[PDB]
C-alpha cells in the first residue's frame, strides 16, 4: 500500500515540476481565496466549502472523445421512380451507429418573386412503407427562396432500429404554386446547388 501511495506522490510532483511537496504554512483566509478564484473564473465554489475547477481541461478532453464517438452523415437525395418522391440510400456507416442524436431533411423552396401575399404554405413529408407515415408537417415562410429544415430524428432512429438503411420520401405542397413557389426535388442546371439532402448525426 505505502510504496504505491508514494509512487503517485512522486508522479504528481514531477508533472508540477516540483522537487518536493510544499512546506506547511498558514494559508490565506478562505473568504479571500474563494472570492478571488470566483472573480477570476478559475474555480467555482459550492456553499459550505466544496470547490470545483472552472474551465477544467479534463472536461474538454471528455468532450473531444464524445465527438470522436459521433459521426455526421450527409445523404443526398436520389430521384424517385414516382412523382414528387426522393430516394435516400444512407451510408453503411449508419450500421455502426446505434443512437440517433440528430436527423434533418433539407429542402430548398424557390421563390422567384418576393411576395408579401400568401406568406404561409404547408409542406408535408411522407415516408413510404408496406402505407405512408408522416415524417414532418411544417408551415414555412414563402417570402423568398430559402432553405427549410425538417426534423425527422425519431423516424430515422426508428428506421435504424429496424435495421433498414433506406428512406423513400413523398413531398406535398398544394399551396406552393399559387404562392409562386416550388420545392427543388431534382438538381436542375445551375439549380443543382439546391439538391435536397438528409443529414444524420449519430454516435456509438
Amino acid at each position: 500500500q505505502p510504496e504505491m501511495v508514494e509512487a503517485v506522490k512522486k508522479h504528481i510532483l514531477n508533472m508540477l515540476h516540483l522537487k518536493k511537496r510544499p512546506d506547511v504554512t498558514q494559508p490565506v483566509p478562505k473568504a479571500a481565496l474563494l472570492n478571488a478564484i470566483r472573480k477570476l473564473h478559475v474555480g467555482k465554489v459550492g456553499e459550505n466549502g466544496y470547490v470545483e475547477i472552472e474551465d477544467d481541461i479534463g472536461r474538454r478532453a471528455e468532450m473531444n472523445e464524445l465527438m470522436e464517438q459521433t459521426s455526421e452523415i450527409i445523404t443526398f437525395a436520389e430521384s424517385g421512380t414516382a412523382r414528387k418522391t426522393l430516394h435516400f440510400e444512407i451510408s453503411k456507416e449508419g450500421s455502426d451507429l446505434s443512437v440517433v442524436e440528430r436527423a434533418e431533411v433539407w429542402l430548398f423552396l424557390k421563390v422567384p418573386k418576393a411576395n408579401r401575399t400568401r406568406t404561409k404554405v404547408t409542406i408535408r413529408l411522407f415516408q413510404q412503407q408496406k402505407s405512408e407515415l408522416l415524417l414532418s408537417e411544417k408551415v414555412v415562410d414563402a417570402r423568398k427562396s430559402t432553405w427549410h429544415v425538417f426534423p425527422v430524428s425519431s423516424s430515422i432512429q426508428r428506421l435504424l432500429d429496424q435495421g433498414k438503411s433506406s428512406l423513400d420520401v413523398r413531398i406535398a405542397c398544394e399551396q406552393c404554386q399559387e404562392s409562386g413557389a416550388s420545392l427543388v426535388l431534382l438538381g436542375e442546371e445551375k439549380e443543382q446547388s439546391h439538391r435536397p439532402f438528409l443529414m444524420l448525426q449519430a454516435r456509438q
Binding site: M4, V5, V8, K9, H11, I12, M15, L16, L18, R21, P22, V24, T25, Q26, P27, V28, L33, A36, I37, V42, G43, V51, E52, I53, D55, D56, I57, G58, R60, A61, E62, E65
Partner: protein, 82 residues
Amino acid sequence: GLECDGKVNICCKKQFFVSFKDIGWNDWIIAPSGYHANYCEGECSCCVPTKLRPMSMLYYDDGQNIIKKDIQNMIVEECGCS
C-alpha cells in the same frame, strides 16, 4: 479497452483512486478532490498507455500563491499492447 480485474494477465489497466485526504495533501491541493492513478501492467509489446486524458489542478505553491495548471497525459484512460 481491457480492464484488469484480479486474476487476468493480459495487458489491461488497473484502477486505484487516490484521495488527497488520506495522503495528507488536501491542504495545499485545493482542487480536485483526488487523482485517478490508473496504470498499465501485463505482458505482451510493452503494454503502453494508448488513450491519455489531460487534468487541471488547483493548488498552493506558497502561502500566498495559487496555481491553475493543465497537465497533458496526466490520466491514463485506456491501454493495450504496443
